[PDB]
Design a protein around this ligand. Structure first.
Ligand code: NA
Lengths: 220, 230
């Protein structure tokens, strides 16, 4: 089959930067008889299906911003974004339709850089309904921060707890370029009821002092 | 101008036959130049073309699966179907249908939202939905966070909305995490004005279609009393 090789695998740029990404095919996609290149580009935003950007290597689909330009011929193709916007975070895929079987590249992930932003931190004790059902999850919610890599520290009665913690991040926001995350500490009800103070602390590259929320079991 | 929507079984067991349907509007496979294809994407992976069919009933299939695939179109012209025989775990993926953007060439101009198919012998389980109640401990400045914990379900996905879709700004529904138990869990958290907590009702609408689980959970504020504290 024709192998489509995309590079770089990922890149991160601030709003306004020019970006170029490359797609190289293992054989030429130029049909000698009509001098057309049988290549399309797609954009896949987080949580969405792919959307067609370009076909015939350089023809832009209706509704696609003119900041996207496809170029190249034969085996070596480029998608250029003249000035990136915050909403352009996505995986970009090329695809050949020169010959069966039809094949896609492995994608280039485009992420957005912005100024550091400290999270706001929220904490939620186990619900009485969960406690009645027999479990205990303490949920910590970190909102609108940057960069993605933030450290979350849990303490139970002043001692650091790492076991039993599950973390999940939202995809990067298409408007403000920030992240949010949840950190969930799950214990048995009996284990939860054996301790009093619960603390979630976020440490980032914004501040040296953490952003903290804490509660005492029963003290409510 | 065009819509496409995939539907499938959500989950099926290894060795069974997957039956997928694409229902579409704004074009018909009764009409010259129209065709539809199927493309899949395993979680965190790339795109694989599977099969496509044209108005003239010509069908093409990916040789990596050809023996196992059957594509067809409905006589009405408004649906296309894909069958995959003898599924295994490599068939777990999001399945998309998409219209070809040409009468003879195979790029795809409009795509459906996709349908997730999980190949698994594990049992279907619906989630428990627990409130994440707002308090001083979820309040910073003039903003309060509140949410729902959607716990212990299988397979994916669940959908969560707030106030039937009335509330959308400031909503963060986290990707599910598969726990060692074989069950998923996630939380959906929304941030709202703290001054609104007394007068505005907040309900999370959770739907887990594989288990026919539908829950509308009202999330009530829970302020804390601080003993012996000024
Ligand atoms: Na610029």
């Amino acid at each position: 089959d024709i192998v489509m090789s995309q590079s770089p695998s990922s890149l991160a740029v601030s709003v306004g930067e020019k970006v170029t990404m490359s797609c190289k095919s293992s054989q030429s996609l130029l049909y000698n008889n009509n001098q057309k290149n049988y290549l399309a580009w797609y954009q896949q935003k987080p949580g969405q299906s792919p959307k067609l950007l370009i076909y015939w290597a350089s023809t832009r689909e209706s509704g696609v911003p003119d900041r996207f330009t496809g170029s190249g011929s034969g085996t070596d193709f480029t998608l250029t974004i003249s000035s990136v916007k915050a909403e352009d975070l996505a995986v970009y895929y090329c695809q050949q339709y020169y010959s069966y079987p039809f094949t896609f590249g492995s994608g280039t992930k485009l992420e957005i850089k912005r100024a550091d932003a400290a999270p706001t931190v929220s904490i939620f004790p186990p619900s009485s309904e969960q406690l009645t059902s027999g479990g205990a999850s303490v949920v910590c919610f970190l909102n609108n921060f940057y960069p993605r890599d933030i450290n979350v520290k849990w303490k139970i009665d002043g001692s650091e707890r790492q076991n039993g913690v599950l973390n999940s991040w939202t995809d990067q926001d298409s408007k403000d370029s920030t992240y949010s995350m949840s950190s969930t500490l799950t214990l048995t009800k009996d284990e939860y009821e054996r301790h009093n103070s619960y603390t979630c602390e976020a440490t980032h590259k914004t501040s040296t002092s953490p952003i903290v929320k804490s509660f005492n079991r029963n003290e409510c | 101008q065009v819509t496409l929507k995939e539907s499938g079984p959500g989950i099926l067991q290894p060795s069974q036959t997957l039956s997928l349907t694409c229902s579409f509007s704004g074009f018909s496979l009764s009409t010259y130049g129209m065709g539809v294809g199927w493309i899949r994407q395993p979680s965190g992976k790339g795109l694989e073309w599977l099969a496509h069919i044209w108005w003239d009933d010509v069908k093409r299939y990916n040789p990596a699966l050809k023996s196992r695939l059957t594509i067809s179109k409905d006589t009405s012209g408004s649906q296309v179907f894909l069958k995959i025989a003898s599924v295994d775990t490599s068939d777990t993926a999001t399945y998309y249908c998409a219209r070809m953007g040409s009468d003879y060439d195979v790029w795809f101009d409009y795509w459906g939202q996709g349908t997730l198919v999980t190949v698994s012998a594990a049992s279907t389980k619906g989630p428990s939905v627990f409130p994440l109640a707002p308090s001083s401990k979820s309040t910073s400045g003039g903003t309060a966070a509140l949410g729902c914990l959607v716990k212990d379900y299988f397979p994916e996905p669940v959908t969560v909305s707030w106030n039937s879709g009335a509330l959308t700004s400031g909503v963060h529904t986290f990707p599910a995490v598969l726990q060692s138990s074989g069950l998923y869990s996630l939380s959906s958290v929304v941030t709202v004005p703290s001054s609104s907590l007394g007068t505005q009702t907040y309900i999370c609408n959770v739907n887990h279609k594989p288990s026919n689980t539908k829950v509308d959970k009202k999330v009530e504020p829970k302020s804390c009393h601080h003993h012996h504290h000024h």
